Design an enzyme around this catalytic site. Structure first.
Site, PDB file in Angstrom:
ATOM      1  N   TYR A   1      52.559  26.037  37.065  1.00 59.36           N
ATOM      2  CA  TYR A   1      51.457  26.887  36.671  1.00 59.36           C
ATOM      3  C   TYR A   1      51.829  28.364  36.683  1.00 59.36           C
ATOM      4  O   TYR A   1      52.770  28.786  37.361  1.00 59.36           O
ATOM      5  CB  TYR A   1      50.204  26.634  37.542  1.00 59.36           C
ATOM      6  CG  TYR A   1      50.292  27.204  38.957  1.00 59.36           C
ATOM      7  CD1 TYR A   1      50.828  26.404  39.944  1.00 59.36           C
ATOM      8  CD2 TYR A   1      49.868  28.500  39.237  1.00 59.36           C
ATOM      9  CE1 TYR A   1      50.958  26.902  41.220  1.00 59.36           C
ATOM     10  CE2 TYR A   1      49.996  29.008  40.511  1.00 59.36           C
ATOM     11  CZ  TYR A   1      50.553  28.193  41.491  1.00 59.36           C
ATOM     12  OH  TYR A   1      50.720  28.661  42.768  1.00 59.36           O
TER      13      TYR A   1
ATOM     14  N   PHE B   1      48.880  36.900  38.590  1.00 55.48           N
ATOM     15  CA  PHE B   1      48.925  37.005  40.027  1.00 55.48           C
ATOM     16  C   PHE B   1      49.844  35.944  40.626  1.00 55.48           C
ATOM     17  O   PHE B   1      50.226  36.084  41.786  1.00 55.48           O
ATOM     18  CB  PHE B   1      47.499  36.961  40.646  1.00 55.48           C
ATOM     19  CG  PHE B   1      46.683  35.715  40.353  1.00 55.48           C
ATOM     20  CD1 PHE B   1      46.932  34.519  41.012  1.00 55.48           C
ATOM     21  CD2 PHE B   1      45.703  35.784  39.380  1.00 55.48           C
ATOM     22  CE1 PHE B   1      46.218  33.388  40.652  1.00 55.48           C
ATOM     23  CE2 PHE B   1      44.989  34.653  39.044  1.00 55.48           C
ATOM     24  CZ  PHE B   1      45.256  33.453  39.664  1.00 55.48           C
ATOM     25  N   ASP B   2      50.209  34.849  39.930  1.00 57.22           N
ATOM     26  CA  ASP B   2      51.083  33.829  40.519  1.00 57.22           C
ATOM     27  C   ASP B   2      51.727  32.913  39.482  1.00 57.22           C
ATOM     28  O   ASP B   2      51.173  32.739  38.398  1.00 57.22           O
ATOM     29  CB  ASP B   2      50.308  32.994  41.545  1.00 57.22           C
ATOM     30  CG  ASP B   2      51.161  32.136  42.467  1.00 57.22           C
ATOM     31  OD1 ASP B   2      52.351  32.378  42.612  1.00 57.22           O
ATOM     32  OD2 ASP B   2      50.633  31.207  43.055  1.00 57.22           O
TER      33      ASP B   2
ATOM     34  N   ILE C   1      40.774  24.669  44.146  1.00 61.23           N
ATOM     35  CA  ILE C   1      39.512  25.064  43.546  1.00 61.23           C
ATOM     36  C   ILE C   1      38.976  24.028  42.576  1.00 61.23           C
ATOM     37  O   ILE C   1      39.725  23.259  41.955  1.00 61.23           O
ATOM     38  CB  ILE C   1      39.599  26.463  42.878  1.00 61.23           C
ATOM     39  CG1 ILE C   1      40.664  26.508  41.758  1.00 61.23           C
ATOM     40  CG2 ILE C   1      39.809  27.517  43.968  1.00 61.23           C
ATOM     41  CD1 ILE C   1      40.742  27.805  40.970  1.00 61.23           C
TER      42      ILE C   1
ATOM     43  N   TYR D   1      36.773  31.276  42.883  1.00 60.80           N
ATOM     44  CA  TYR D   1      36.505  31.880  44.180  1.00 60.80           C
ATOM     45  C   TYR D   1      35.175  32.594  44.285  1.00 60.80           C
ATOM     46  O   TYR D   1      34.897  33.232  45.307  1.00 60.80           O
ATOM     47  CB  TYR D   1      37.663  32.843  44.520  1.00 60.80           C
ATOM     48  CG  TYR D   1      39.026  32.157  44.632  1.00 60.80           C
ATOM     49  CD1 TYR D   1      39.335  31.399  45.755  1.00 60.80           C
ATOM     50  CD2 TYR D   1      39.915  32.231  43.575  1.00 60.80           C
ATOM     51  CE1 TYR D   1      40.514  30.667  45.806  1.00 60.80           C
ATOM     52  CE2 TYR D   1      41.102  31.509  43.621  1.00 60.80           C
ATOM     53  CZ  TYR D   1      41.386  30.736  44.738  1.00 60.80           C
ATOM     54  OH  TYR D   1      42.562  30.042  44.796  1.00 60.80           O
TER      55      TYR D   1
HETATM   56  C1  LIG Z   1      51.792  30.512  48.965  1.00 63.51           C
HETATM   57  O1  LIG Z   1      51.134  29.931  47.885  1.00 63.51           O
HETATM   58  C2  LIG Z   1      49.975  29.216  48.179  1.00 63.51           C
HETATM   59  C3  LIG Z   1      49.113  29.187  46.923  1.00 63.51           C
HETATM   60  C4  LIG Z   1      48.641  30.529  46.389  1.00 63.51           C
HETATM   61  C5  LIG Z   1      47.606  31.124  47.338  1.00 63.51           C
HETATM   62  C6  LIG Z   1      46.811  32.269  46.727  1.00 63.51           C
HETATM   63  C7  LIG Z   1      46.272  31.871  45.334  1.00 63.51           C
HETATM   64  C8  LIG Z   1      45.487  33.052  44.691  1.00 63.51           C
HETATM   65  C9  LIG Z   1      47.415  31.251  44.433  1.00 63.51           C
HETATM   66  O2  LIG Z   1      48.318  32.291  44.046  1.00 63.51           O
HETATM   67  O3  LIG Z   1      48.081  30.243  45.158  1.00 63.51           O
HETATM   68  C10 LIG Z   1      46.885  30.557  43.164  1.00 63.51           C
HETATM   69  O4  LIG Z   1      47.479  30.748  42.095  1.00 63.51           O
HETATM   70  C11 LIG Z   1      45.749  29.720  43.178  1.00 63.51           C
HETATM   71  O5  LIG Z   1      44.636  30.227  42.985  1.00 63.51           O
HETATM   72  N1  LIG Z   1      45.825  28.387  43.317  1.00 63.51           N
HETATM   73  C12 LIG Z   1      47.072  27.683  43.657  1.00 63.51           C
HETATM   74  C13 LIG Z   1      47.268  26.588  42.654  1.00 63.51           C
HETATM   75  C14 LIG Z   1      46.104  25.615  42.684  1.00 63.51           C
HETATM   76  C15 LIG Z   1      44.827  26.392  42.397  1.00 63.51           C
HETATM   77  C16 LIG Z   1      44.607  27.570  43.334  1.00 63.51           C
HETATM   78  C17 LIG Z   1      44.146  27.099  44.712  1.00 63.51           C
HETATM   79  O6  LIG Z   1      43.269  26.244  44.804  1.00 63.51           O
HETATM   80  O7  LIG Z   1      44.677  27.645  45.914  1.00 63.51           O
HETATM   81  C18 LIG Z   1      44.313  27.242  47.187  1.00 63.51           C
HETATM   82  C19 LIG Z   1      43.273  28.272  47.673  1.00 63.51           C
HETATM   83  C20 LIG Z   1      43.873  29.634  47.874  1.00 63.51           C
HETATM   84  C21 LIG Z   1      42.555  27.812  48.940  1.00 63.51           C
HETATM   85  C22 LIG Z   1      41.679  26.562  48.835  1.00 63.51           C
HETATM   86  C23 LIG Z   1      40.580  26.618  47.774  1.00 63.51           C
HETATM   87  C24 LIG Z   1      39.782  25.324  47.694  1.00 63.51           C
HETATM   88  C25 LIG Z   1      39.210  24.943  49.074  1.00 63.51           C
HETATM   89  O8  LIG Z   1      38.588  23.662  48.984  1.00 63.51           O
HETATM   90  C26 LIG Z   1      40.296  24.907  50.205  1.00 63.51           C
HETATM   91  O9  LIG Z   1      39.687  24.807  51.466  1.00 63.51           O
HETATM   92  C27 LIG Z   1      40.305  23.984  52.394  1.00 63.51           C
HETATM   93  C28 LIG Z   1      41.090  26.216  50.208  1.00 63.51           C
HETATM   94  C29 LIG Z   1      45.629  27.139  47.931  1.00 63.51           C
HETATM   95  C30 LIG Z   1      46.339  25.815  47.672  1.00 63.51           C
HETATM   96  O10 LIG Z   1      46.362  25.291  46.554  1.00 63.51           O
HETATM   97  C31 LIG Z   1      46.970  25.152  48.895  1.00 63.51           C
HETATM   98  C32 LIG Z   1      47.930  24.038  48.444  1.00 63.51           C
HETATM   99  C33 LIG Z   1      45.870  24.534  49.772  1.00 63.51           C
HETATM  100  C34 LIG Z   1      45.343  24.977  50.912  1.00 63.51           C
HETATM  101  C35 LIG Z   1      45.829  26.235  51.606  1.00 63.51           C
HETATM  102  C36 LIG Z   1      44.201  24.249  51.647  1.00 63.51           C
HETATM  103  O11 LIG Z   1      43.670  23.210  50.812  1.00 63.51           O
HETATM  104  C37 LIG Z   1      44.643  23.592  52.993  1.00 63.51           C
HETATM  105  O12 LIG Z   1      43.479  23.417  53.758  1.00 63.51           O
HETATM  106  C38 LIG Z   1      43.647  23.499  55.130  1.00 63.51           C
HETATM  107  C39 LIG Z   1      45.318  22.236  52.816  1.00 63.51           C
HETATM  108  O13 LIG Z   1      44.693  21.182  52.917  1.00 63.51           O
HETATM  109  C40 LIG Z   1      46.806  22.249  52.496  1.00 63.51           C
HETATM  110  C41 LIG Z   1      47.156  21.157  51.482  1.00 63.51           C
HETATM  111  C42 LIG Z   1      47.632  22.123  53.762  1.00 63.51           C
HETATM  112  C43 LIG Z   1      49.081  22.572  53.695  1.00 63.51           C
HETATM  113  C44 LIG Z   1      49.724  22.527  55.073  1.00 63.51           C
HETATM  114  C45 LIG Z   1      49.073  23.982  53.145  1.00 63.51           C
HETATM  115  C46 LIG Z   1      49.734  24.361  52.069  1.00 63.51           C
HETATM  116  C47 LIG Z   1      49.604  25.722  51.515  1.00 63.51           C
HETATM  117  C48 LIG Z   1      50.104  26.033  50.328  1.00 63.51           C
HETATM  118  C49 LIG Z   1      49.859  27.372  49.776  1.00 63.51           C
HETATM  119  C50 LIG Z   1      50.346  27.819  48.626  1.00 63.51           C
HETATM  120  C51 LIG Z   1      51.297  27.049  47.693  1.00 63.51           C
END
Ligand SMILES: CO[C@H]1C[C@@H]2CC[C@@H](C)[C@@](O)(O2)C(=O)C(=O)N2CCCC[C@H]2C(=O)O[C@H]([C@H](C)C[C@@H]2CC[C@@H](O)[C@H](OC)C2)CC(=O)[C@H](C)/C=C(\C)[C@@H](O)[C@@H](OC)C(=O)[C@H](C)C[C@H](C)/C=C/C=C/C=C/1C
Length: 107
Positions: free
Chosen positions: A26, A36-37, A56, A82
């Site tokens: 993506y 932004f990413d 999301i 968001y």
């Molecule tokens: C460094 O890069 C980040 C991603 C960045 C963060 C900031 C945003 C701008 C962004 O640049 O991605 C982005 O482009 C974005 O908006 N994305 C990422 C691509 C998918 C769509 C969206 C998103 O939903 O982000 C997500 C958004 C920011 C937060 C969520 C939004 C939906 C809501 O339901 C969730 O509540 C729980 C929180 C980030 C993610 O896709 C990651 C994977 C998921 C989470 C952190 C949470 O779901 C967490 O909850 C504990 C989990 O269950 C995870 C799996 C546990 C494991 C250990 C953590 C992995 C973390 C990976 C983080 C990654 C690769």
């Protein structure tokens, strides 16, 4: 909601199921704004499990209607992204997001 517009067609047959891991590339940007990413920069695909609320709402609904191999532009309204709070430091309140998403593989 989320609008899905095709950049390149997938196979039209293999669609994600709830609980499957989707493997995607993506690029994200604000509507008529800043990129932004991108996972492409990082040379590493992003994986998430469909249906677990990890991402999301616009991605949950958007990616579910894509088949393997498809590349699509997803336009996501703030309420499917968001919302009025934004994502601190990165996404402002009430931002419309556009993602280029390529569904590589399901695991
Ligand atoms: C460094 O890069 C980040 C991603 C960045 C963060 C900031 C945003 C701008 C962004 O640049 O991605 C982005 O482009 C974005 O908006 N994305 C990422 C691509 C998918 C769509 C969206 C998103 O939903 O982000 C997500 C958004 C920011 C937060 C969520 C939004 C939906 C809501 O339901 C969730 O509540 C729980 C929180 C980030 C993610 O896709 C990651 C994977 C998921 C989470 C952190 C949470 O779901 C967490 O909850 C504990 C989990 O269950 C995870 C799996 C546990 C494991 C250990 C953590 C992995 C973390 C990976 C983080 C990654 C690769």
């Amino acid at each position: 909601g989320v609008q899905v517009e095709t950049i390149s067609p997938g196979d039209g047959r293999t669609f994600p199921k709830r609980g499957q891991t989707c493997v995607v590339h993506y690029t994200g940007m604000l509507e008529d704004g800043k990129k932004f990413d991108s996972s492409r920069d990082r040379n590493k695909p992003f994986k998430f499990m469909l249906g677990k609320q990890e991402v999301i709402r616009g991605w949950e609904e958007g990616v579910a209607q894509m088949s393997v191999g498809q590349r699509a532009k997803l336009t996501i309204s703030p309420d499917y992204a968001y919302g009025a709070t934004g994502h601190p430091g990165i996404i402002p309140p009430h931002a419309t997001l556009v993602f280029d998403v390529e569904l590589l593989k399901l695991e």
